[PDB]
């Protein structure tokens, strides 16, 4: 492990070169010493605040919220130093870590970061206040390289369909729970109570994991099937018949 | 001795916090506890109880030294301290001692000069670090750091600077962070092995 | 049979009037408040640019 | 009396030095000639608006709704010239008068005034439309120097408890009044009707006074106790028992 | 004689208004009375029956002089006033006369200069203060004061001035109050001991 540490009692203008010495080592190790590197960049929001602080002292035409107008082209020269190259057996994976101001995902920093990175993992506050760990809200989370990393011969043939159906069920259950809390606990239909039981068991059994628990992928998929078995097999429209026939009746 | 108020006094090491800061309130002791060496913020509108919470905390807590910074607030709230505290006492060895024998105030009220609201904050946190170095556990009440932010915005306006958010300078968060990063439990610089601590409780006035 | 009808209709009338009064006194005022707030906050963002 | 009259067809930028002339006169009469002065400053809103106009004239940093960023530090140089000093037998009691735009108490003028002054007396429109005088709404009201001015040897031993209990009962009555607008008149309990009776008798007997009526504070406290006897002494959960033993039965 | 429109004309004393403004309608005369020297406001909207007010003021009223003001009205809405007003008649001493023997009109449309659609209110009030100083009782009427406020906002905008609530200038209430403070009953300057009055009726379009 190599550490570069800029604490909150340290100079602010160093934060501009800190993510670039950490990404120049990771590039030497991966593309010259041929190892697989994992780069963590903690508070990519402090870096942008230092950027704004230097741009405001130069009397430049400001962007949105005061951040520089070239913050997109600046974050893209940090985020785009990741991947594999031909002929060399090394890689670089990047996991930046933002904190959205006021839990706002349309702030300039999260907005511009979303235009550059391949997805995002969304840590929610509503799930935190109900003692769920890890409090990951899967509805605005996304991974754009998933379709080509999963499936038959890589993880298991039922991965994508289980994931799609779990997502659709969670969405429908949230849209139910809204008006259930609003208009009528008894005006709920007979199946508008299966989505609520799915909500509860999915947030307590699939999401909530444990701070030292290491699940395989196949355990995750088995729990997903145990949750999908709440619904009669006619309500799973996002799963083909060949997969339902092989995995549902257990 | 003489010390620059903008340079942090050195230590040997910063340790983790393992002991409670007992206020006198049922809530804030049961549900949201602070520790000896932590950092707290009390945001609220006007008339909510930031000053009463701060003054009760400074009267009844378990700290050895209390520094009270009144930064841009009422001048009748410093006369309530200079009147109440010489009457309250605490028991040590059978003898009773007033709680003003261990308190220091730094007052810059709201009609005093606006540029001295900054110099007030740094004057308090440098007295919290002089006593912590002796081996004491200090608590520092900063009443309305929002007045410090307003002083910063005023000075930045007189300089014709580019605002950042709602008028404030772009370096407001840096000042706030480097001020709150002076609170903690420490192993004190020097050969006799001591252990000190400085807690900060900052009121915000949105 | 007329009395049975009478009773069930009498309770359903109360339930529906309760729903009307809730949507009229609790929900719509809240939506209008959070609409006026948004108008104010956008007006405030413009004055800084 | 000494009047300083600046009317609506007079110079706007001279509204900035009128309260300072008034307060210099007050300080001379109080801290040098040793009298008890009462200062009435009418429409600090017009002062604040003249201040905004002069600030916008020379392009300074604004705060909320265009008011200068130094409006707190400017109003505080006016409001803070009021009190007593050691060794002199005078005082200065200030009573500014405000007008809140659109009855909003979050506007910059009332919001910055309430951070500087030691309380406020809230004049309500909803009580004016019911032909009530004085139309004072006691929930958004406050006085920060009351706790040290009431009690044994100052007014009477029970002042504070009666005040706190009247506050609690008034708030719960106003909660019930809004619950019944949804659940109807005939869904309330036996105690909700006690609260709805307290509300009416309070608004008509305690608040409503008449414009030339001078109630000594003991009359006010007797009216408060006559209002608190609506409830059994076990509903009054803010009054200690040794006060209810002496003042409740009478 | 020549008089600047942004300066109030001098009087000997501003008296309190204690005499009715008779309009002729049973409502507005019993339930909602106005006085000679008062200030009224109506809603100026489409299809609300708004001409009754101005026609009643012109034909059957205790006023001596009438001053009508359009502050930026539509093009075809002005062509209706400039057609209807020269047609109204009164009866005096038994004979029938035209109301345009004691009436003056100020007429603007939406494409006339923006600095005339703004100074219209001041021209009207100066004319009425001129006829009040003779001993008469004048009643001014400003149609769509909102169309004046918008020309005010636009003149501000041109000068690159900081906006206020909803973009209107900072000095909007000051102007709207110093305008309506020019109405009332007065004792006129000068020797032959007379007394006059000005009654303003504004119209708003929310």
UniProtKB/Swiss-Prot annotation, chains A, D:
It comes from the Eukaryota. ATP binds at residue 144. GO terms for biological process: ATP metabolic process; proton transmembrane transport; regulation of macroautophagy; synaptic vesicle lumen acidification; vacuolar acidification. Kidney; localizes to early distal nephron, encompassing thick ascending limbs and distal convoluted tubules (at protein level). One of its GO terms (cellular component) is plasma membrane. It is linked to Zimmermann-Laband syndrome 2: A form of Zimmermann-Laband syndrome, a rare developmental disorder characterized by facial dysmorphism with bulbous nose and thick floppy ears, gingival enlargement, hypoplasia or aplasia of terminal phalanges and nails, hypertrichosis, joint hyperextensibility, and hepatosplenomegaly. Some patients manifest intellectual disability with or without epilepsy. ZLS2 inheritance is autosomal dominant. Deafness, congenital, with onychodystrophy, autosomal dominant: An autosomal dominant syndrome characterized mainly by congenital sensorineural hearing loss accompanied by dystrophic or absent nails. Coniform teeth, selective tooth agenesis, and hands and feet abnormalities are present in some patients. V-ATPase is a heteromultimeric enzyme made up of two complexes: the ATP-hydrolytic V1 complex and the proton translocation V0 complex. The V1 complex consists of three catalytic AB heterodimers that form a heterohexamer, three peripheral stalks each consisting of EG heterodimers, one central rotor including subunits D and F, and the regulatory subunits C and H. The proton translocation complex V0 consists of the proton transport subunit a, a ring of proteolipid subunits c9c'', rotary subunit d, subunits e and f, and the accessory subunits ATP6AP1/Ac45 and ATP6AP2/PRR. This is V-type proton ATPase subunit B, brain isoform.
Swiss-Prot record, chains B, E:
The modification Phosphoserine is found at residue 178. It is found in: Cytoplasm; Cytoplasm, Cytosol; Cytoplasmic vesicle, Secretory vesicle; Cytoplasmic vesicle, Clathrin-coated vesicle membrane. Phosphorylation at Ser-178 by AMPK down-regulates its enzyme activity. ATP binds at residues 44-51. High expression in the skin. Changing residue 50 to Q: Complete loss of interaction with Rabies virus protein M. It comes from the Eukaryota. It is linked to Cutis laxa, autosomal recessive, 2D: A form of cutis laxa, a disorder characterized by an excessive congenital skin wrinkling, a large fontanelle with delayed closure, a typical facial appearance with downslanting palpebral fissures, and a general connective tissue weakness. Most ARCL2D patients exhibit severe hypotonia as well as cardiovascular and neurologic involvement. Epileptic encephalopathy, infantile or early childhood, 3: A form of epileptic encephalopathy, a heterogeneous group of severe childhood onset epilepsies characterized by refractory seizures, neurodevelopmental impairment, and poor prognosis. Development is normal prior to seizure onset, after which cognitive and motor delays become apparent. IECEE3 is an autosomal dominant form characterized by onset of seizures in the first years of life. Catalytic subunit of the V1 complex of vacuolar(H+)-ATPase (V-ATPase), a multisubunit enzyme composed of a peripheral complex (V1) that hydrolyzes ATP and a membrane integral complex (V0) that translocates protons. V-ATPase is responsible for acidifying and maintaining the pH of intracellular compartments and in some cell types, is targeted to the plasma membrane, where it is responsible for acidifying the extracellular environment. Belongs to the ATPase alpha/beta chains family. This is V-type proton ATPase catalytic subunit A. It comes from Homo sapiens.
UniProtKB/Swiss-Prot annotation, chain C:
Disulfide bonds: none annotated. It is found in: Membrane; Cytoplasmic vesicle, Clathrin-coated vesicle membrane; Cytoplasm, Cytoskeleton, Microtubule organizing center, Centrosome; Cell projection, Cilium. Belongs to the V-ATPase D subunit family. V-ATPase is a heteromultimeric enzyme made up of two complexes: the ATP-hydrolytic V1 complex and the proton translocation V0 complex. The V1 complex consists of three catalytic AB heterodimers that form a heterohexamer, three peripheral stalks each consisting of EG heterodimers, one central rotor including subunits D and F, and the regulatory subunits C and H. The proton translocation complex V0 consists of the proton transport subunit a, a ring of proteolipid subunits c9c'', rotary subunit d, subunits e and f, and the accessory subunits ATP6AP1/Ac45 and ATP6AP2/PRR. Interacts with SNX10. Subunit of the V1 complex of vacuolar(H+)-ATPase (V-ATPase), a multisubunit enzyme composed of a peripheral complex (V1) that hydrolyzes ATP and a membrane integral complex (V0) that translocates protons. V-ATPase is responsible for acidifying and maintaining the pH of intracellular compartments and in some cell types, is targeted to the plasma membrane, where it is responsible for acidifying the extracellular environment. May play a role in cilium biogenesis through regulation of the transport and the localization of proteins to the cilium. This is V-type proton ATPase subunit D. It comes from Homo sapiens (Human). The lineage of its organism: Eukaryota, Metazoa, Chordata, Craniata, Vertebrata. The chain holds residues 150 to 198 of 247 of the full protein.
